[PDB]
Amino acid sequence: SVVTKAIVSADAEARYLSPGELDRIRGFVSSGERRLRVAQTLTESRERIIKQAGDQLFQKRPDLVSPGGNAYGAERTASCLRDLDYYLRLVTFGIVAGDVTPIEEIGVIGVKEMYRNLEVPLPGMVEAVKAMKSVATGLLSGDDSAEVGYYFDYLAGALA
Amino acid sequence: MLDAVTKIINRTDAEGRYFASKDFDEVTRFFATGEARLRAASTISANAASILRESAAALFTEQPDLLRPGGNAYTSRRYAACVRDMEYFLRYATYALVAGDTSVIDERVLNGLKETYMSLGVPIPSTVAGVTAMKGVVASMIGSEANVYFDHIAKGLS
Amino acid sequence: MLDAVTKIINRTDAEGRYFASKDFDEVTRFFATGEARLRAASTISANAASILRESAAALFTEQPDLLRPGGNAYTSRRYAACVRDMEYFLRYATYALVAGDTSVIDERVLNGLKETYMSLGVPIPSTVAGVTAMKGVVASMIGSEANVYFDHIAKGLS
Amino acid sequence: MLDAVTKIINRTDAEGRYFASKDFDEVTRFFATGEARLRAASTISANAASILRESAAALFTEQPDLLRPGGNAYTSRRYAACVRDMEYFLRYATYALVAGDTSVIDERVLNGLKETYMSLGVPIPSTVAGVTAMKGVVASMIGSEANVYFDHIAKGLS
Amino acid sequence: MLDAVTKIINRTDAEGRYFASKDFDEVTRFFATGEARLRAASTISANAASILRESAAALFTEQPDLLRPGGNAYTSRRYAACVRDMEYFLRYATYALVAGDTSVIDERVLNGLKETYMSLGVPIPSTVAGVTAMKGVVASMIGSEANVYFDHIAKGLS
Amino acid sequence: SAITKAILNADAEARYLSPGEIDVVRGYLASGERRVRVARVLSDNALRIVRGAGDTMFQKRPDLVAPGGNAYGEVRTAKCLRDLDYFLRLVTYGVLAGDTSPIDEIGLIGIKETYSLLEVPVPGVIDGIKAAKQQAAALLSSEDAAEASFYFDYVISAMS
Amino acid sequence: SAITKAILNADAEARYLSPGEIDVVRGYLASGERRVRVARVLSDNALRIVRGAGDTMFQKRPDLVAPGGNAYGEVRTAKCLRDLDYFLRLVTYGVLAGDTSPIDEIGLIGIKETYSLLEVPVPGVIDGIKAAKQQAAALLSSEDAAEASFYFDYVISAMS
Amino acid sequence: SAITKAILNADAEARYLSPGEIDVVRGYLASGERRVRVARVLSDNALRIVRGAGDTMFQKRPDLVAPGGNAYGEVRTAKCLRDLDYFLRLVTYGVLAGDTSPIDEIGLIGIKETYSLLEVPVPGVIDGIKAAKQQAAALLSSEDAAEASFYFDYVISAMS
Amino acid sequence: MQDAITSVINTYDVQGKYFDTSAFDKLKAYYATGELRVRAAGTISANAATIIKEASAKLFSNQPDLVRPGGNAYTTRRYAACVRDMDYFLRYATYAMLAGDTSILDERVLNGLKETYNSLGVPISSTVQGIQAMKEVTGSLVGSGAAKEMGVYFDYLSSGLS
Amino acid sequence: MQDAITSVINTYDVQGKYFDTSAFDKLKAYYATGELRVRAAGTISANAATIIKEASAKLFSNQPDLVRPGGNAYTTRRYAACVRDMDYFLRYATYAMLAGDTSILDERVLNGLKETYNSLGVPISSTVQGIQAMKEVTGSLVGSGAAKEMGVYFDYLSSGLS
Amino acid sequence: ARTISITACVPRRTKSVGASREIQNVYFTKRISFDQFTPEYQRIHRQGGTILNVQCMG
Ligand SMILES: CCC1=C(C)/C(=C/C2=NC(=C\c3[nH]c(/C=C4\NC(=O)[C@H](C)[C@H]4CC)c(C)c3CCC(=O)O)/C(CCC(=O)O)=C2C)NC1=O
Ligand SMILES: CCC1=C(C)/C(=C/C2=NC(=C\c3[nH]c(/C=C4\NC(=O)[C@H](C)[C@H]4CC)c(C)c3CCC(=O)O)/C(CCC(=O)O)=C2C)NC1=O
Ligand SMILES: CCC1=C(C)/C(=C/C2=NC(=C\c3[nH]c(/C=C4\NC(=O)[C@H](C)[C@H]4CC)c(C)c3CCC(=O)O)/C(CCC(=O)O)=C2C)NC1=O
Ligand SMILES: CCC1=C(C)/C(=C/C2=NC(=C\c3[nH]c(/C=C4\NC(=O)[C@H](C)[C@H]4CC)c(C)c3CCC(=O)O)/C(CCC(=O)O)=C2C)NC1=O
Ligand SMILES: CCC1=C(C)/C(=C/C2=NC(=C\c3[nH]c(/C=C4\NC(=O)[C@H](C)[C@H]4CC)c(C)c3CCC(=O)O)/C(CCC(=O)O)=C2C)NC1=O
Ligand SMILES: CCC1=C(C)/C(=C/C2=NC(=C\c3[nH]c(/C=C4\NC(=O)[C@H](C)[C@H]4CC)c(C)c3CCC(=O)O)/C(CCC(=O)O)=C2C)NC1=O
Ligand SMILES: CCC1=C(C)/C(=C/C2=NC(=C\c3[nH]c(/C=C4\NC(=O)[C@H](C)[C@H]4CC)c(C)c3CCC(=O)O)/C(CCC(=O)O)=C2C)NC1=O
Ligand SMILES: CCC1=C(C)/C(=C/C2=NC(=C\c3[nH]c(/C=C4\NC(=O)[C@H](C)[C@H]4CC)c(C)c3CCC(=O)O)/C(CCC(=O)O)=C2C)NC1=O
Ligand SMILES: CCC1=C(C)/C(=C/C2=NC(=C\c3[nH]c(/C=C4\NC(=O)[C@H](C)[C@H]4CC)c(C)c3CCC(=O)O)/C(CCC(=O)O)=C2C)NC1=O
């Protein structure tokens, strides 16, 4: 989170937190209620987000669900969608944490190795994450939409 | 590195005086343009990989000789290093766009870059063409907000 | 580094000859002046902070613009670096007073100092004035015995 | 570093073609000469101490003022370093003889050597005289098969 | 020896105070964990022979040299002493698990053990490896509840 | 500034600005008017702040301006007031930049060595800076005074 | 080459060529004629090997040349077949050199980054290179086919 | 030199000469008359010492000057005597300097591998230097002979 | 390290669930105390040297044998190391209070500290007394709620040592 | 590390003996198996990624809770760490098979591995299951005689971890 | 901050010779951060080296 990052940064320098770091934490905690409301909103619409995201992904990448595809069949498509569920929950974690740390450790570090070992194509992952961005930012107001779009962009960049 | 506010602070400190009315006006101008600059930077960052992909394609359609055997961009290694350098330019231009100042481009990118490119045998006019193609792509996406930083890269390389 | 005895030794080793009457004479003169040089060095060491304080005060009384905003010594960091260079000069001229040879000044002090200062923007004439002020302060305490080493430093900068 | 086969590969790769008949002919000729070059390298290796000893003796009989007090080879350490440099030259000439190409000499030996000898004070013509004496001993023991690499070292020095 | 209750009593007495609310809470927390600790102690007691067997097997699989001629576990007597030591560690760690305090280990196990091992030449890092292997086996059976006590023995040997 | 610190952070990991760093930059640009107001008040009132801080410091510690004191004499007293003015201007810079970097670069790095070798009592400087902090708080509202006090106490803690 | 590796290993220890290294160099020199024979067969038939490999790959994966595929169109298919040709040439280089160093220096180092940035499906490349290996094995004898397959499998393993 | 060692010890700690270092320099300066006397006696008698030591060494090791010996022949025997002269002059240098730094720098660093590479028998050199030590002690008083024997023994121990 | 927010995140990730009402209550509870924590951290950071001076003075007054000869805090080096360790405890308590979680005290402080002090001969009871002195001094600066919060982490350090 | 050759050299050198007929028989047997070992090593290196893919697929099919939340291989970071562990196991098993000797497994893999897995919480039985999966897939790839040879080193790793 | 390019010649006159390649660390050109400059300046001086060129990149 913002707090853990600031504390670790200060600790590697053996100092108390600076006025800048404390200003960062004040801005983080004063934004906490809005962040929790946005996280609730994205949690409420999780199933819809995953459903239209999978719809768009398979519409724009029909080879994935076609024979020979990585997500071909019912159970493989279910695993495909379960990955989008994982990543949406990671996005909600990152929103309450105030940065992309939880996303990075739970879902970004080692992901290239894991989707290589799984034959999951990464451009497909990027398209799926962008589809989730569109669906999820469709559900929020002006400031929240950009704020959540930043986390989705972080995922898309880290998968590419 | 310097942003605009620190550049103003440095001038006032060199003169040894407190901030005056015009200095606060310049600071307020930076604070006014900051939001648009942040939006442009976020747009670039969200599409960094796409920007890099069409910028590389535009440069190598413009100069197919580089990809040919005997060219400086001919190998998987040298192609990777070339797109790596272009990614440097894009990311540091975005940094300069947020900071409102070109300093970070100076001490992080252009400092010693020409000497490096002569030592390596990198064709500098082609690198400038790549920077110009990147400028065109970024301007098509976010507008003319980042033009001065790409021009600064191109002129510091020339 | 070399002291007087090792300098004479290196000379005789350059001709590949044993010590002759003049070499033993130089050595015995050095041994004769050793006690006076030792007392001068102990006097300098006992009053190091006082000498440095007075010399910095003299430097910045004669050249007040070094401390004014925009001057090379204007910040706490740059002032500290100035006073630290002067501390170096005092300590190494004391070393050379004990050794009896300006070698240690050439290897440990003047080697690359001029290029360093020019690359940094440190003014050489102001540092030479500081060395002159330090020389006067030291000669006000120990006499004219350390003069040659401060002169060596000043001409090495000059 | 490169050997003859890798050098031909780089020549085919710069112009981006498959190996043609001429290239295969050059490679086959290099493969035909391999046993003689290997035996020459083994002969040098088995007599490296001797070759070094009489090559150093030949140099210092040719130029005795190197050893004299004040000469560049006058001390146990400087003589050690001179003979060590000659060991460098012998071992790297043998590497180049096995490889069939002089790139290893250019990268490991000749890269920066002239500047380092100017900075150190090692006389280049005397070092070249030592290289030629070592060439003479090596040619007496194995024939003219290694002269090209010693000439390469000498030309790179002078 | 002491247990958790006696440890808290001595702490309150060192201050000459009655039990405060926090002290009562600590004693209640100790009482609440009593049933799990007793079932864990009974589980260890029921499987002590198997625990010792797998622990010794793990130790000597890691370091087979110990059993070879010239090793410190090489003889019937020396292997017997090794497994007897591990059996002592197991029984006294069970005692400390029941008491909730590591004082029984200090009183009965680490009372000259490190000096004894250094005197006899018992390889302490190997003994610690064995203790840690026994910790792993016990954790596989009952969980982490005993880990700290085993760690205590290791820290007593290091 | 805060922007520079976020950019340096993102550059160390060779990435674009993350959602947390965008939040830091946005919250800093939001605070611009408040920072400019605080800096204007402190700058336009530098003379009376320094006069008052120096008076309070000298009343608290007379031995400084007594014979044998570090500040004795017109010249040394003038340099003492000039140092207080320097630290006030550094505080204004820290308020404008939204972080303590200009204060460190221009005034703090080396000030301990400087004052040790010049025999300047650091507790006296701390007393003068505390006096300047209260004199500034007299001139500012509660929120503006709290904003300035962060950098004043940062200077004081760097001294101590 | 093998010679370069032996020389570098001897130079790292600042010593002359050891008897094991001399045996390595001698064995490579002895194998030179067979290496030249395999390389000549590979080079003289590059067009047909690459054509057969491209046909086999595109038959296995028609989507790569279907609309929306990475190699769709004449230009991109030409680049695809050119890539396969590059890998065939580098295989001849590695057969001749006796080691994989030319393959790494010219075409393997950095290829993963290049293809990932270009969204080139690496499994498609591996299928094409495997098809090329089958084409080569058709023209070569069994021992020669094994010798060429060593470097073919090296390329495949480096990509995967 | 002793003074050089004291100054290097001070310099490594960025300090002035400690009382121990000052006492060392004072003792070295006090020993100057006896150091000069010993060195002058050895320097005036160098030809006698070297001729006598060479005579004793060839009388104890006749093989060196016999055909097949390392020092066989007028030129090689002259070089042998020149090496003995070198080591006596280095002993006088060490006596004057009050330490063994001149001996190490000029003559000992690299001497062992030098003689091993030239096939020069180190037992022969050691015998020559022991003979030189005896010849020097014959010309010096017992107290002065001990001071010179310190450095003769240092050279011998360096070779042994 | 782990703060309160990432503690909730870790529980819910391990059990693999999105946040529910209970997680949101824990997160609201953390955010609500955030301004008090930031204020207390700023106050402690501004006063850390004074807190250490007062606490070390009270400790060495209560146990004068520490700084007299034969005491573990007798030399300029060992006195400096003593107050350095007190600076540790104050700084890491401030970290744990700002994070609202004691995990950093486990990872960065308490792990191996008893072994370090027992190997060195540093008296741990006197160290606990010094921690208590810092607890009262810090509470004297930060006020009721912040004092009660900081006391939790001071007591955690005391329990981990004692 | 020791191979078969160096193992024989070690025994005869510690006994200070020249090679006799028994030594020559042993060295001759190693030279005889050398071609089979080289072919198996080449086959394994060509198919290493495929082996890891199939074996991890089998392991996570038999124990699907490892990759779900709460499993030790649930996160991208821990999944990557797991498949990386399998890759190292396969590469060292191939090394030991080439050398015809398990010494490299003692020197580079097994020592302290069990205690590390216990300290991290890696399920050691599941790791042994993954090694057994790699064995089955590898033996399918490399053929019967090479399967017998390679399974010896796979089982050596499995027993070291059990 | 700022980087300074130092070109220096650092001989090996204080120790015996060796067969390993040594030329690169004897004569070199590296640029270091400003905060590392004084330690490297003094380290070159202590090993008997000579500072040949000092440049401030920019
Ligand atoms: C962020 C600061 C930074 C910069 C700016 C930077 C530039 C840089 N580019 C390099 C190589 C290169 N740069 C290029 C790029 C050129 N190829 C041409 O075809 C193109 C027209 C042109 C680019 C548009 C290439 C091909 C290489 C490889 C050169 C070689 O290895 O032969 C190198 C040599 C080291 C290496 O290979 O990694 C540097 C230092 N490095 C840095 O750390
Ligand atoms: C022991 C041998 C030794 C010497 C001689 C030495 C000199 C030296 N002085 C330096 C900087 C400096 N030197 C000065 C001093 C000058 N400026 C003032 O105006 C005066 C006129 C004048 C002094 C009387 C200053 C101000 C700097 C800081 C340069 C800057 O940061 O802009 C630096 C750059 C490294 C740094 O500042 O951290 C060196 C290496 N360092 C050594 O290790
Ligand atoms: C109830 C408290 C108690 C303890 C703790 C205890 C330990 C203990 N172990 C001893 C010897 C020993 N301990 C060992 C064990 C070592 N061998 C190594 O290979 C292993 C790494 C390691 C064991 C894991 C061995 C081999 C000896 C015999 C050493 C000798 O006699 O030379 C001895 C010396 C006297 C004897 O041989 O019985 C004691 C006192 N005895 C006790 O009465
Ligand atoms: C812009 C950044 C900057 C700072 C921070 C700075 C501090 C500073 N103060 C100095 C002197 C001084 N500073 C003081 C101030 C002291 N008098 C009392 O004791 C008080 C406790 C205390 C002030 C509240 C005094 C009296 C001197 C003169 C001392 C002397 O002449 O030896 C000096 C030495 C050179 C000079 O005379 O100016 C510096 C570098 N200089 C700078 O360029
Ligand atoms: C000699 C060393 C060397 C190699 C190995 C090499 C590969 C290579 N292929 C490239 C493009 C490409 N490569 C391919 C081929 C791939 N896409 C298809 O689907 C297949 C699965 C697969 C081939 C079997 C395609 C289609 C492109 C064009 C992609 C684009 O520009 O959008 C590029 C980017 C530059 C360009 O040609 O535009 C490189 C560097 N280049 C080299 O200089
Ligand atoms: C001032 C520092 C210095 C020293 C110490 C020194 C010793 C020295 N003696 C040498 C040769 C020699 N040294 C000797 C002396 C040996 N022969 C007998 O066996 C004796 C045991 C023994 C002398 C006591 C001889 C005979 C040679 C000639 C060997 C040859 O050229 O093959 C050489 C090789 C170059 C030459 O021929 O001059 C050196 C460097 N040179 C120096 O510049
Ligand atoms: C053996 C090395 C050693 C030293 C030197 C040492 C000094 C020392 N001095 C102390 C107090 C003190 N020390 C002084 C001395 C100062 N008074 C004036 O200012 C003078 C400038 C100066 C003395 C010449 C004073 C006044 C105190 C009481 C300070 C206070 O309690 O506020 C204390 C605090 C505990 C106590 O009072 O016993 C220590 C530990 N401790 C050590 O382990
Ligand atoms: C919380 C962090 C985390 C993630 C994200 C994660 C992903 C993950 N996805 C898996 C399977 C899968 N994942 C996918 C997804 C792909 N299919 C299409 O190509 C799409 C481009 C893409 C999804 C949008 C598919 C098809 C499978 C089934 C693979 C198989 O059956 O072998 C598996 C193997 C175990 C299982 O199936 O339960 C993992 C571990 N694991 C983690 O611990
Ligand atoms: C493998 C590539 C390589 C080369 C070529 C190389 C040359 C080399 N020779 C050196 C010293 C030296 N080299 C010589 C060479 C002799 N001077 C004259 O007497 C002779 C004519 C001549 C030889 C025939 C000498 C005398 C020194 C010592 C110089 C000194 O320390 O003052 C040094 C300085 C470091 C040291 O003392 O070891 C280098 C770098 N180093 C390398 O790593």
CA C67 to chain centre: 23
d(CA B98, CA J145): 65
Whether the CB-CB separation of C115 and C17 falls below 8 Å is answered with no
d(CA G122, CA I100): 48
Q: Which two tokens stand for residue J46?
A: 């060509």
Q: Which two tokens stand for residue I25?
A: 């209550």
Strands K3-9 and K50-56: antiparallel
d(CA H21, CA H6): 6
Whether the CB-CB separation of I86 and I126 falls below 8 Å is answered with no
Among chain H residues, the shortest Cα distance to C5 is held by H97
d(CA F82, CA F73): 14
Phi, psi torsion values for E19, nearest 5 degrees = -65, 125
Decide: helix, strand or coil at residue H121: coil
d(CA J81, CA C99): 62
Query: G160–J42: do the CB atoms touch at under 8 Å?
Result: no
| CA proximity to B153, closest of B94, B101, B105 | B105
Strand ranges (E), chain A: none
Q: Would you call E115 exposed, middle or buried from its count of C-beta atoms within 10 A (0-12, 13-18, 19+)?
A: exposed
In angstroms, what is the C-alpha Rg of chain K? 12
Please, how many CA atoms are within 13 Å of residue B88, restricted to the half-sphere of its CB?
A: 16
Cα G50 to ligand 5 centre (Å)? 15
The partner residues of K31 in beta bridges, in order of sequence, read K5
Q: Which two tokens stand for residue A21?
A: 């770091």
Cβ neighbours, 10 Å, residue G129? 22
Distance set, CA B10 to CA B14, B144, C69, C77, E73 (Å) = 6, 28, 11, 15, 73
The DSSP symbol for G18 reads P
| CA proximity to B91, closest of B141, B35, B52 | B52
H55's CB contacts (< 8 A; 6+ apart) are: H131
Q: Would you call G52 exposed, middle or buried from its count of C-beta atoms within 10 A (0-12, 13-18, 19+)?
A: middle
Cβ neighbours, 10 Å, residue D77? 23
The DSSP symbol for G138 reads H
Whether the CB-CB separation of G72 and G114 falls below 8 Å is answered with no
Strand ranges (E), A17-75: none
Residue G13 φ/ψ region, left for φ over 0, alpha for ψ in the -120 to 50 degree band, beta for the rest: alpha
Whether the CB-CB separation of B71 and B123 falls below 8 Å is answered with no
Cα D142 to ligand 5 centre (Å)? 50
**Residue of K13, K26, K27, K47 to test ligand 9 pocket, by largest number of atoms within 8 Å of CB:** K26
What sign results for the dihedral spanned by CA atoms I140, I143, I145, I150? negative
| AA identity, residue G134 | Q
| AA identity, residue H67 | P
Whether the CB-CB separation of F44 and F88 falls below 8 Å is answered with no
The DSSP symbol for F160 reads -
Cα H83 to ligand 6 centre (Å)? 6
| AA identity, residue I41 | A
| CA proximity to F4, closest of F106, F111, F96 | F96
Residue E57 φ/ψ region, left for φ over 0, alpha for ψ in the -120 to 50 degree band, beta for the rest: alpha
Relative to the CA of C130, which ligand 2 atom is closest? Answer: 24
Q: Would you call I77 exposed, middle or buried from its count of C-beta atoms within 10 A (0-12, 13-18, 19+)?
A: exposed
Q: Which residues line ligand 4 (CB under 6 A)?
A: C 57, 60, 67, 74-76, 79; F 64, 70-71, 76, 79-80, 83-84, 86, 106-107, 111, 114, 118, 120-121, 124-125, 128
Cβ of I60 below 6 Å from ligand 7 = yes
Whether the CB-CB separation of H76 and H124 falls below 8 Å is answered with no
Residue F110 φ/ψ region, left for φ over 0, alpha for ψ in the -120 to 50 degree band, beta for the rest: left
User: From which experimental method does this structure derive?
Assistant: cryo-EM
How far I127 CA lies from chain J's nearest CA (Å)? 30
Resolution in angstroms comes to 2.5
Report which secondary-structure segment, H or E, holds A3: helix A2-11
Q: Helix B124-142 to helix B21-46 angle, to the nearest 10 degrees?
A: 90
Q: Which two tokens stand for residue G100?
A: 């994989």
How far J127 CA lies from chain E's nearest CA (Å)? 15
Residue contacts between F and I (CB atoms, under 8 Å): 12
Return the residue in B3, B6, B35, B42 with the most chain A beta carbons within 10 A, the one to mutate for interface testing: B42
| AA identity, residue I16 | G
Please, how many CA atoms are within 13 Å of residue I16, restricted to the half-sphere of its CB?
A: 13
How far C70 CA lies from chain H's nearest CA (Å)? 31
